[PDB]
Each structure stands twice: as structure tokens, then as C-alpha cells.
Ligand binder design. Structure first.
Ligand SMILES: CC(C)CCC[C@@H](C)[C@H]1CC[C@H]2[C@@H]3CC=C4C[C@@H](O)CC[C@]4(C)[C@H]3CC[C@]12C
Ligand SMILES: *[C@@H]1O[C@H](CO)[C@@H](O)[C@H](O)[C@H]1NC(C)=O
Ligand SMILES: *[C@@H]1O[C@H](CO)[C@@H](O)[C@H](O)[C@H]1NC(C)=O
Length: 985
């Protein structure tokens, strides 16, 4: 075993060496034929760039920023498959004046009516393109049933008789039972006007299906564009209709039918649920108007001021009407966003002591996805930010690669060093595009980072070259240089790539892509450095030999071997006691080094210095610990969208003027049997099999639990208001419900829904199959709150309230934010797992390149300590541990390992007798590269700080912390730690 270990250590070294020797020779080849390498590398890069032609973006927010658990998603599916939801467009008008003033009001009125005026031509409908693929045929049985149901629906509706006598109310079997079609046949749904949405799949291409009055019977997919242009539909055609009239929620409902008059003040009996008597249509003034100012007279309030008026337009959500709806919404959003009434408000007084203003915000279902498209493209701002960053790093590079002796200085390399990285980004991206990898919104930051990381290798190479001033034959110098820095530049990259790849495994596609693209970019960039940049180094080197400055060479063109460690050691020894030990004036890094040797190192060596260092880092870690205590997770999905987004702006306004009406949480109940049955025709709660298998809704106690639940949820502070029809029904006619007869229950509830005014309002929240309430629902408003954590807290509580365990009844609380927030729960662990894998993998790699084992252990300690610091301080800075932040933390390992490793490897390879000696040598030889690498990266990413997109700024903040601690520890703590307890001999 000992012999085996010996042989192994022999292999590692031997191999590590061989690799170096190989690069040593490769350099020679490039040195002799620099042009060939540059031209070929560039052309090859271009080809990859061509790949961009196939660049396909990804715009499904859910895939981009959600686990896609297939659970909450499944919930949406179930909800949509059986319950008819309704597309709702929200239009809010905000101002600093009393929009209630008659003159303004009248204008606002036309604004509203304008919506109805909006008209969409058929040609606009993209879905029903003049040439498309007909949707897959709906299962035959499904078709049959749809035919049957639609037929009986009419029949029943005509009859109007609600009779449950025939319905068998026997408890269903485990199979839900108590010839597929026959089974699905003979099913009476109530309300009769309901047919399971899933079964509703008729080709919407035939206009006859969607809009009947048209009487056209014209297939849009088979119609001329001009012909389609001819036909035009309006909101009324695709709007939910109350009492045969679009069910808007505008204030103007009050004035309808002369119930009230714009010119006169608004006086209503109840601000909560006033009803226009003439129209018999109800309205919630509190919901419609914001910042209301009302008086009280004869029990009738006198609304006399409001600086916000919101109108909700309800549009059908049926599959058939889906394509058409989207079209109208698009027209609507444009219309509202550009509508302006500044003229009327010009002289009207303000309450904000600011210029009279009026703004029309609008939010439709298509809004979110549309905004995703906007975030998909590369904002000009981002572009600009990149440019600034590139300039910064360009300046920094040059400012460090230029000197008094121009021919000695190597500006060319620096310049191309930057490009090298960029070209890498393009080439890599193109390669991935070729592979089909879709781009993501977070990819905007990829260029920024890639460039920064790449330029770092440039510094390293140059450092080796410069420190090899002794060498006379340039070819040899370049060769030796590359040989010296080969392992370093290779490992550094390898580590980075590895980390990103490991991260790519993330479920969230955004992270996956961002990482994948970055990793590929880094890879190709490295290749470019070994080719392009190296070739440029060769050219400049050759010029230096001739002492020909770049410009000089241009006009003109138009017309031994010693370990650097050995040398540096000898230098110090010699110092302790010539040309070899005197860097030529203008060596690329001559100054900085001198500064480090004559100032920084002395300080570090100083006991007082050390004292300071240790204490400083001490407190740093301490602060980090407290930071961890203040750890908060989660970020609102909307944050993704730029703040400027009208969506974001809309939400803000709503919150400001309508705080109570925040999240419209919706709770649903879905009999497992019913769901399963119909789900079948179209070939967590599931925890317990009998969770919702069979519920006797006639059980008075159960009924009582229901009303109690309503009361409980109402009590909850976060809940602002609830609308549970069942409660209304139970309270309305509990006496009749006293007798617990299943059939009786069905009939009573059915009639209640059919007749009672309130009941009619809740007609679409209850569905009965064969006399049994297979599914139902109720909704409640949850006050708006920013913290994702507290939000989830509230929702989770709601779930508890909605779980009649005694009667085996568990209802599902649903909200859009649910899926996104759901991810927050597991973010804490997944990160640990990923980080762990990364750390390990990276450590293993370093171990194979770090000579001493003890040095490896030192590195690990440093890495972990940094990570604690970067995490602790992110929490301390308030950076929530969101997806964006976490990935950066996990990825941080790569950056940190690089800087730490360089110093460590040097200290080990030092020939210094005393530990301190080694430290000084290591620092004098690698401190420059380390500093340059980190700083360069930060400079490029600095501009991201001014990015509108929230996720971007988080990226900047987190990475800035990473880089900071990395460089800090690598340049300060690590040195002193090694100087005190470092591997010796
Ligand atoms: C005795 C009665 C008249 C008092 C007032 C009852 C009101 C507050 C009840 C009865 C009908 C209920 C409405 C029924 C339908 C809907 C549409 C749904 O998408 C949101 C909730 C909402 C808007 C309900 C809100 C609360 C509601 C308006
Ligand atoms: C329901 O139908 C059955 C069978 O036709 C009949 O006997 C009973 O009287 C009906 N009850 C009603 C009309 O509610
Ligand atoms: C019923 O369920 C599905 C859909 O028709 C099918 O796979 C199965 O064979 C059917 N069986 C019968 C009895 O029709």
C-alpha cells in the first residue's frame, strides 16, 4: 500500500509535469507561426458565432423561474379542466385630483366606453392562421359525451325542473362506482349551463363555432387574409354578459339607467355592495374607487372625492374564445396605455402639491408573458452598461500593461485579451445555439462575467513572461512562460467550468441556461487564450526583442532555463547579501511588485501587521455569523420584470390606492372520483386516499364546520374579505337543511343558486354531478405584502383552515404566486447539496494540482471561511437568499479557489527557508495576478449595479461580495495564516 501511494504521487507529479512540457513545446509552435493561429482561431470563432442565427429564446416564466413541480401546476390544470375561470382585464386610472369631479368623470366615461368601441378584425387572430395544424382530435368518447352533455344541457335548461329523485346518492366505491361511454353517459350536471370545461374542445378555427351571430360558418384557417380582415368582432362579442350586458365593474354602473347622474354627487346606501336599482346590477364602490372620501347622510354616504378609479372587464376564458380574447386584450392594453386626459386635469387642484397628473394603468392576462418577451431581448441599457464595463476593464488592463518603455510594455496583448473573452462568449453561445439551447433572461449578465473571468488568464500569462525577463531568446521565453503558467490557467478555467456545469443541474431553466452558456463561453475563451492571445503575445514579444514599439514595428512592417521560484529566492538571498536580479525598467509588473515587496509584504510580516490582519478578519467573520442569523429567503416573481414594466407599475398603483384588495386567493374543492373519472375520458391532497373521495355535504356538523371555517378565515388579519357562497346558502336556509337528505340538499342548493339573488351571483362556484356536489369553490382577498416569507406564511395558514379532517374534506388554496413561492421552501437545502458537490469536485481537482496535502486542507478552510463570509454578509446586506443569489454562492467556489490556490501553490513551490520567506516569495510572484484578476472582474460587473432589472442588481451585489472576500482573504488572511502555520519543507 505504501509502495502504491508512492507510485501514485509519482504519477501525479510526472503527469502534471508532462502536461507542462507539452504546452512548453506548443508555445514554440505558435511562436514560430503566430499569424496562422490568429487567423484560424478567428475564423473558427466566427463560424460558431453564426450559430446565433438559430438563437431561440425561452419566454415561459414558469419554466424560467419555477420548479415545475408538476404539483401546483397540476393544480392549475385541474382548476382549469373542471372550473370555468374568467379572463379579467384590469384598468386603473390614478391621479392627484378628485377624478370624481363631474368634468373629469365624463371624460373617464368615454374612456371606458372606448373599450367597447375597440374592434378586432379576424385577420388579426394569429392562432387561426390562414394555414396551420388543426388541434388533435378530441377522444372519440369525449366527443360523444360532449354531444350528449351539450344536448341534455339544453334539454334540462329548457325544462327548468331540478329533480333529484332519480339520482342515486349511494356512496361511491374505491373505483368511484356505485362501456366507457355508457358510464360517462347519463350524467346530469348542475348548474345545467355547465359542461366540464375539458370536454369543450371544438375547432375555434371555424368562426361559426366561436361567434354564432356571424352566421358565417367560415374557417379562418381556410380563409383569405383579406376575407378575414373583412370580419371584425368587439368586446361585447367576447365578454362575460350580466343581464345580457357585459359585466364591467365600472363606477359608471351607478349612473346607469338614470339611477344616478354624473353631474350630481354619488349617494349610495352601502359603499360595500350598492346595487343600481334600475339596472338591478350590483357594484362594490370600495373596490371600484380608491382613496374614497365619503360623507354620511340619512344612512347614505356621499362619495365626494377619489384619486383612483379601477374598472375590470371580464372576458371569456373558454378554449374556443381564448385566441380571440388575447387579440382584444392586446388592442385594449395599447388603447388604455396611450389614452390621455391631461387637458381636463390641467387646472384641477392637486393633493400631492405636484403638477396635476393622470395615468391609465392596465393589466391583462397576456401582460405577464408579454413582459417576459420584453425582458427576453437585450435592453439597450444593458448593452450600454456592458460597453462601459468593457471600457473600464480595458482601461484597467492597459493601465497595468503599459509602461515607460513602450516596446517592453505590451498594450496589444491587453487589448486583445479583452476581445479574447468576448469572442469566447460569442463562439460559445453560438455553439450552444447550434445545439438548440434556448436563451434566458438572466443570460444578459453572461457577457459581463465571461469577459472578466477571461481577462484574468491574460494577467497570469503576462506575469510569467514579465518575471522571465532574464531569458534572452524570446522563443524560449514564451515557451518557458507558457510552461510556467500552463497548469494555472488550465486549472483555473477547469474549476470555473465545473462549478457552472454543476449549477446547471438546477431545475430552474433560467439558472440552467445561464450556467450552461457561461460555462461554454469560458471554455472557448480559454481556447482563444491559448491560441489568439498567445499568438499576439508572441508578436509583441518579438517586437520587444527588436526594441520595436508597436507603432515602430507597424511603420517598419509597412516599409538559460531557471525556475522562477529559484530566481526569486536567489534574488532575496542576493538581496540579503545584479542584472539578473534587477527587473528591466518598464517590466510590465515591475512597479506593483516593488510596491508589494517594499510595503505590503513588510506589513504582513510585521507582527503588528499580523495582529491587525487577524483581528480584522476576526470581526469580519463575527459579523458574518450574525448575518446568518438574519437569513431571509424568497423574492416576489414580479421582481424579475423591470420595474419600469407597466405590469410592475400597475401593481404598485393598485397597492397604493387599493391596499385591501391584494392577492385574490381562490380555494377549490375537487371530488377525487369526479376529477379522476372525467380526467380519464381525455386519456399534498393526494397524500391520503380518502382525502376528498366522498363527502356528505348534508351532514349538518360538516355544514357547521364550513361556516366556522369561513368565520375563522375571516378573523385572520391578513384576510381582507371572503366570498363563500356556500356559507351564504347555509346561513340563508339552514332550517330547511336541518333534515340531512342528500337529494334534499341537492335540490335546495340548486334552487337557491337558481333563484336567490346572492345565489345567482355564486352560480359558477358550485358544480353538481348526478345530484352530488362534485366540485365547488370560494374566494378571499389577502392583503398585499412584500415579504415572500410572510406571504407564504399566510397562505399556509389558509390551507390549514381549509381542511375539514373530521369529514375528510381538504380544499386547495390557489394563487399564481404559489408556484414561485413554493420553490423558496427547498432553496435552503438544494443549495447546500449543490455547494457540497461543487466544493468537493473542485477540491478534488485542486488536490491533484496542489503539491502538498496540508496546503490543500488550508485552501479548503479558506474557501469555506469565505463562503461563510459571503453568505453572512449577503444576509447582513439584506440580499434575500433567492435563486439568483444562491447560484452565485455555489458558483463562488470557483472564483475563490482560483485566487486562494495561486497563493497557496506559490507558497509551497517557494524555496524560502523560513515560513515567512516563502510567504514573501509567493506574494511577490502571485499577488499581482490575483489582484488583477479579481479587480478586473468587478470592474466589468460594476455597471450591472445600474441595471433596472432586479435580478441583475442582485447578481452584481452578490458577486461583488464574492470577489471582495475572495481577494481579501486570498491576499491578506491566507498570506498571514500561511506565514504562521504554513507547509514547510
Ligand atoms: C346580502 C348580500 C347582497 C350582501 C353582499 C354580498 C356580496 C358582498 C357577495 C355576494 C355575491 C359575491 C360575489 C359573487 C361573484 C364574484 C365573482 C368572483 O370572481 C369574485 C368574487 C365575487 C365578486 C363575489 C364577491 C362577494 C359577493 C359580491
Ligand atoms: C322526479 O322524477 C320522478 C320520476 O319521474 C318523479 O316520480 C318525481 O315526482 C319527480 N319529482 C320532482 C318533479 O321533483
Ligand atoms: C376505457 O378507457 C380508455 C379510453 O377508452 C381505454 O384505454 C380503455 O380500453 C377503455 N375500456 C373500455 C371498456 O372501453
Amino acid at each position: 500500500v505504501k509502495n502504491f501511494i508512492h507510485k501514485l504521487k509519482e504519477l501525479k507529479q510526472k503527469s502534471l509535469d508532462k502536461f507542462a512540457n507539452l504546452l512548453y513545446d506548443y508555445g514554440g509552435y505558435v511562436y514560430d507561426r503566430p499569424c496562422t493561429f490568429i487567423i484560424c482561431s478567428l475564423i473558427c470563432c466566427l463560424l460558431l458565432t453564426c450559430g446565433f442565427y438559430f438563437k431561440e429564446h425561452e419566454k415561459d416564466i414558469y419554466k424560467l423561474y419555477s420548479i415545475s413541480n408538476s404539483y401546483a401546476y397540476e393544480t392549475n390544470e385541474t382548476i382549469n379542466d373542471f372550473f370555468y375561470k374568467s379572463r379579467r382585464c384590469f384598468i386603473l386610472v390614478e391621479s392627484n385630483v378628485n377624478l370624481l369631479k363631474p368634468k373629469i368623470l365624463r371624460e373617464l366615461q368615454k374612456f371606458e366606453e372606448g373599450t367597447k368601441d375597440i374592434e378586432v378584425d379576424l385577420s388579426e387572430i394569429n392562432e387561426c392562421k390562414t394555414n396551420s395544424e388543426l388541434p388533435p382530435e378530441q377522444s372519440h368518447v369525449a366527443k360523444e359525451l360532449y354531444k350528449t352533455l351539450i344536448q341534455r344541457s339544453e334539454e334540462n335548461l329548457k325544462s327548468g325542473k331540478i329533480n333529484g329523485s332519480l339520482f342515486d346518492y349511494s356512496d361511491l366505491d374505491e373505483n368511484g362506482k356505485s362501456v366507457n361511454f355508457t358510464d360517462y353517459k347519463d350524467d346530469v350536471f348542475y348548474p345545467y349551463q355547465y359542461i366540464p370545461p375539458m370536454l369543450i374542445k371544438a375547432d375555434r378555427c371555424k368562426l361559426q363555432n366561436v361567434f354564432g351571430d356571424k352566421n358565417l360558418n367560415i374557417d379562418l384557417r381556410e380563409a383569405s387574409d383579406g376575407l378575414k380582415k373583412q370580419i371584425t368582432y368587439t368586446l361585447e362579442d367576447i365578454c362575460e354578459k350580466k343581464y345580457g350586458d357585459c359585466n364591467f365593474s365600472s363606477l359608471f354602473l351607478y349612473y346607469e339607467k338614470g339611477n344616478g347622474y354624473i353631474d350630481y354627487p354619488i349617494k349610495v346606501d352601502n359603499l360595500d355592495f350598492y346595487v343600481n336599482r334600475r339596472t338591478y346590477k350590483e357594484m362594490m364602490f370600495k373596490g371600484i374607487l380608491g382613496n374614497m372620501v365619503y360623507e354620511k347622510s340619512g344612512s347614505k354616504y356621499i362619495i365626494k372625492s377619489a384619486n383612483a378609479i379601477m374598472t375590470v372587464i371580464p372576458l371569456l376564458n373558454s378554449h374556443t374564445y381564448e385566441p380571440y380574447a388575447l387579440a382584444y386584450e392586446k388592442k385594449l392594453i395599447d388603447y388604455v396605455r396611450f389614452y390621455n386626459l391631461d387637458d381636463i386635469i390641467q387646472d384641477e387642484e392637486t393633493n400631492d402639491d405636484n403638477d396635476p397628473f393622470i395615468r391609465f394603468h392596465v393589466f391583462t392576462d397576456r401582460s405577464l408573458e408579454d413582459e417576459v418577451d420584453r425582458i427576453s431581448k437585450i435592453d439597450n441599457l444593458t448593452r450600454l452598461l456592458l460597453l462601459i464595463g468593457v471600457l473600464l476593464i480595458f482601461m484597467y488592463a492597459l493601465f497595468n500593461n503599459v509602461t515607460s518603455v513602450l516596446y517592453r510594455s505590451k498594450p496589444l496583448c491587453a487589448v486583445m485579451g479583452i476581445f479574447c473573452g468576448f469572442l469566447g462568449f460569442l463562439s460559445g453561445s453560438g455553439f450552444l445555439y447550434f445545439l438548440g439551447v434556448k436563451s434566458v433572461p438572466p443570460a444578459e449578465t453572461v457577457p459581463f462575467l465571461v469577459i472578466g473571468v477571461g481577462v484574468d488568464d491574460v494577467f497570469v500569462i503576462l506575469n510569467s513572461y514579465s518575471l522571465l525577463f532574464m531569458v534572452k531568446d524570446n522563443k524560449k521565453r514564451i515557451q518557458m512562460c507558457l510552461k510556467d503558467s500552463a497548469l494555472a490557467i488550465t486549472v483555473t478555467t477547469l474549476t470555473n467550468i465545473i462549478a457552472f456545469l454543476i449549477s446547471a443541474i438546477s431545475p430552474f431553466y433560467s439558472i440552467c441556461a445561464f450556467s450552461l452558456f457561461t460555462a461554454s463561453s469560458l471554455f472557448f475563451g480559454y481556447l482563444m487564450v491559448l491560441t489568439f492571445l498567445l499568438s499576439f503575445l508572441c508578436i509583441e514579444a518579438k517586437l520587444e526583442k527588436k526594441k520595436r514599439n508597436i507603432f515602430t514595428g507597424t511603420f517598419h512592417l509597412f516599409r538559460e532555463n531557471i525556475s522562477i521560484y529559484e530566481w526569486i529566492h536567489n534574488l532575496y538571498l542576493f538581496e540579503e547579501s545584479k542584472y539578473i536580479y534587477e527587473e528591466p525598467k518598464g517590466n510590465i509588473g515591475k512597479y506593483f511588485r516593488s510596491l508589494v515587496k517594499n510595503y505590503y509584504v513588510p506589513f504582513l510580516s510585521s507582527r503588528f501587521g499580523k495582529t491587525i490582519v487577524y483581528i480584522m478578519f476576526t470581526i469580519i467573520i463575527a459579523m458574518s455569523i450574525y448575518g446568518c442569523t438574519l437569513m431571509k429567503k424568497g423574492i416576489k416573481y414580479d421582481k424579475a420584470f423591470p420595474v419600469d414594466s407597466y405590469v410592475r407599475r400597475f401593481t404598485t398603483a393598485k397597492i397604493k390606492y387599493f391596499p385591501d384588495f391584494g392577492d385574490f386567493i381562490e380555494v377549490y374543492y375537487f371530488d377525487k372520483h369526479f376529477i379522476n373519472k372525467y380526467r380519464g375520458l381525455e386519456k399534498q391532497i393526494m397524500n391520503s386516499p380518502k382525502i376528498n373521495k366522498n363527502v356528505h355535504w348534508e351532514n349538518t356538523n360538516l355544514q357547521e364546520e364550513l361556516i366556522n371555517m369561513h368565520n375563522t378565515l375571516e378573523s385572520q388579519e391578513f384576510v381582507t374579505s371572503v366570498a363563500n357562497g356556500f356559507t351564504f346558502f347555509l346561513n340563508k336556509n339552514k332550517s330547511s337543511l336541518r333534515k340531512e337528505n342528500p337529494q334534499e340538499f341537492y335540490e335546495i342548493f340548486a334552487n337557491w343558486l337558481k333563484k336567490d339573488f346572492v345565489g345567482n351571483l355564486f352560480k359558477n362556484d358550485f358544480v353538481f354531478l348526478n345530484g352530488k356536489l362534485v366540485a365547488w369553490r370560494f374566494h378571499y382577498f389577502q392583503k398585499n405584502v412584500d415579504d415572500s416569507e410572510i406571504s407564504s406564511k399566510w397562505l399556509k395558514a389558509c390551507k390549514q383552515i381549509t381542511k375539514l379532517e373530521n369529514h375528510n374534506v381538504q380544499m386547495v388554496c390557489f394563487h399564481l404566486s404559489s408556484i414561485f413561492n413554493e420553490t423558496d421552501e427547498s432553496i435552503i437545502e438544494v443549495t447546500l447539496i449543490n455547494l457540497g458537490i461543487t466544493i468537493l469536485t473542485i477540491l478534488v481537482v485542486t488536490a491533484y494540482i496542489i503539491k502538498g496535502f496540508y496546503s490543500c486542507v488550508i485552501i479548503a478552510l479558506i474557501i469555506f471561511l469565505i463562503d461563510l463570509c459571503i453568505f453572512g454578509f449577503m444576509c447582513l446586506c439584506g440580499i434575500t437568499m433567492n435563486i439568483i443569489s444562491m447560484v452565485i454562492l455555489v458558483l463562488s467556489v470557483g472564483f475563490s479557489i482560483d485566487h486562494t490556490s495561486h497563493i497557496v501553490q506559490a507558497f509551497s513551490h517557494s524555496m524560502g527557508r523560513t515560513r515567512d520567506e516563502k510567504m514573501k516569495e509567493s506574494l511577490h510572484l502571485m499577488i499581482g495576478p490575483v489582484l488583477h484578476s479579481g479587480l478586473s472582474t468587478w470592474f466589468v460587473i460594476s455597471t450591472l449595479f445600474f441595471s433596472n432589472k432586479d435580478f441583475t442588481v442582485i447578481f452584481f451585489q452578490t458577486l461583488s461580495l464574492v470577489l471582495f472576500f475572495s481577494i481579501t482573504f486570498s491576499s491578506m488572511f491566507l498570506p498571514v495564516l500561511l506565514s504562521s502555520f504554513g507547509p514547510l519543507h
